[PDB]
Write a protein that binds this ligand. Structure first.
Ligand SMILES: O=C1COc2cc(C(=O)N(Cc3ccc(C(=O)Nc4ccncn4)cc3)C3CC3)ccc2N1
Length: 133
């Protein structure tokens, strides 16, 4: 497996910029990786999106990149724009992101860069979400 709980990754979701994340256990499934439809081609990882408006998701491994730092972001943007197969898909990819989401992303980057400087256990202790059902 490429990742484990506490590993830092960028996640790409349609409609959002590459976003800093931490691999975590799903609080119901008690799993951090699975194969969608039990297809060997469809491995997903469970991730927390860093920032002040917490979200989690199951994300395909094909849409994860190991997180080093904010310095990666420009290349990630450039490669996604070059890979957009059509003019129409590229226009969708490049739509502006709100100021409110930009500030969430920027706070996410601060958390992820702090997380990177920490041990796996330290970052899990600090950043793991609380769930209430
Ligand atoms: O500060 C922050 C941090 O997190 C954010 C995430 C998002 C967002 O809607 N996303 C896109 C996104 C896509 C899908 C899901 C998703 O399946 N949620 C699930 C799956 C299973 N059970 C329950 N929910 C969730 C999110 C993430 C950023 C790509 C927007 C703003 C922020 N601001």
């Amino acid at each position: 497996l490429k990742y484990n709980v506490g590993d830092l990754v960028w996640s790409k979701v349609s409609g959002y910029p590459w976003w800093p994340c931490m691999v975590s256990a799903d609080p119901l499934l008690h799993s951090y990786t699975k194969l969608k439809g039990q297809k060997k081609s469809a491995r997903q990882y469970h991730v927390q999106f860093f920032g002040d408006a917490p979200e989690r998701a199951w994300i395909f491994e094909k849409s994860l990149v190991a997180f080093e730092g904010e310095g990666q972001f420009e290349k990630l943007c450039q490669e996604s724009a070059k890979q957009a197969p059509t003019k129409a898909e590229k226009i969708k990819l490049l739509k502006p992101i709100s100021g409110k989401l930009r500030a969430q992303w920027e706070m996410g980057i601060v958390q992820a860069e702090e997380a990177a400087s920490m041990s796996v256990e330290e970052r899990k202790a600090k950043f793991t979400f609380l769930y209430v059902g």
